[PDB]
């Protein structure tokens, strides 16, 4: 819903940490192995 996707691969949350921040987003969630942004 809230999440935002991007052209990201992930093993888990803290992957997406520094490219979400750098996307201008808040963290990010590792879902079915990509990143999803919470903006």
């Known amino acids: 819903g809230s999440g935002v996707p991007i052209n ?3 093993r ?5 940490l520094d490219p979400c921040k750098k ?8 879902i079915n ?3 999803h ?3």
């Not at 888990?12 to 997406?16: E, Q």
């Not at 996307?23 to 590792?30: D, E, L, P, S």
């Open 8 to 10: 990201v691969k992930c």
């Open 33 to 35: 192995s990509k990143c």
């Open 23 to 30: 996307a201008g987003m808040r963290f990010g969630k590792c």
């Open 37 to 39: 942004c919470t903006p």
């Open 12 to 16: 888990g949350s803290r992957d997406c």
